[PDB]
Design a protein around this ligand. Structure first.
Ligand code: NI
Length: 286
């Protein structure tokens, strides 16, 4: 125990610092908006975990204070506990949030694509005080989106994260915990086979379709002639529902960001611990 090995400690600590910094760069730069991006993020966390596994085996020494920092933050042996703890947070918390954003991203794009058609569904009325709305084309497109995202598959499931040809499901209790965590309405909790899933919120779309039927029966052309005031009042209601979906997506992306920030704060604790150890290896008390 009397012979030092600063050279090898410097190499081992440097190696770990580098891998941790690379994983951090990935997790701060790569948005969780596609399967491909999330694969990159998951790989970055694997690279971090592996680096801590290697560091644990390297025999670098921790001071009492560094030891304590690690125990406190993550509540050879110490590094294995740290690796286990951060791995759980990455897989079970951050990785679920990443799936939530990617799934919602594509859903919301599908909605955006319908909004892009609305211009063509609003025509001149019989005179300057009236309009003609293609209520049939609009309702059909919304109902189609509802139908698509009312299914249970990888396009629709927020939790659990999906992969392979089955449907991964959770216990009701675990699913409700995520429902609460995500601040989603109760309609998002769905039974599937032996368990439960959490899916996208269709309620504003369904409300839109209801308000369309509320305007009254279309004419012979499947379109609805409307006085300007009535159209304006309907448009206000439609926008309100668009706002609801926008708000939902916003909550979810902010919560993802905070999950990513929580993981990053742990990474900072790692980097600071390793940096302090590197100073120790380089320092000579006179
Ligand atoms: Ni010795």
């Amino acid at each position: 125990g009397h012979m030092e090995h600063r050279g090898t400690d410097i190499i081992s600590l440097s190696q770990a610092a580098t891998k941790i910094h690379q994983a951090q760069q990935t997790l701060q730069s790569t948005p969780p908006i596609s399967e491909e991006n999330n694969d990159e993020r998951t790989l970055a966390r694997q690279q971090l975990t592996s680096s801590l596994n290697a560091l644990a085996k390297s025999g670098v020494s921790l001071s009492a204070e560094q030891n304590e920092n690690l125990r406190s933050a993550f509540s050879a042996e110490i590094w294995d506990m740290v690796s286990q703890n951060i791995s759980a947070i990455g897989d079970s918390y951050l990785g679920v949030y990443e799936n939530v954003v990617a799934v919602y991203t594509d859903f919301y794009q599908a909605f955006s694509d319908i909004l892009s058609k609305m211009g063509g569904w609003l025509l001149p009325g019989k005179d300057g005080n009236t309009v003609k709305l293609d209520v049939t084309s609009l309702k059909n497109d919304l109902n189609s989106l509802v139908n698509k995202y009312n299914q249970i598959n990888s396009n629709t499931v927020l939790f659990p994260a999906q992969s392979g040809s089955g449907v991964k499901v959770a216990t009701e209790a675990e699913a409700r915990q995520w429902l609460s965590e995500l601040n989603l309405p109760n309609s998002c909790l769905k039974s599937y086979g032996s368990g439960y899933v959490v899916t996208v919120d269709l309620t504003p779309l369904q409300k839109m379709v209801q308000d369309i039927d509320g305007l009254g029966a279309p004419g012979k052309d499947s379109k609805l002639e409307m006085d300007n005031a009535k159209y304006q009042a309907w448009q206000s209601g439609f926008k309100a529902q668009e706002e609801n979906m926008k708000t939902t997506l916003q909550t979810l992306t902010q919560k993802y960001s905070n999950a990513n920030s929580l993981y990053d704060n742990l990474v900072k604790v790692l980097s600071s611990t390793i940096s302090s150890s590197l100073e120790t290896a380089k320092s000579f008390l006179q």
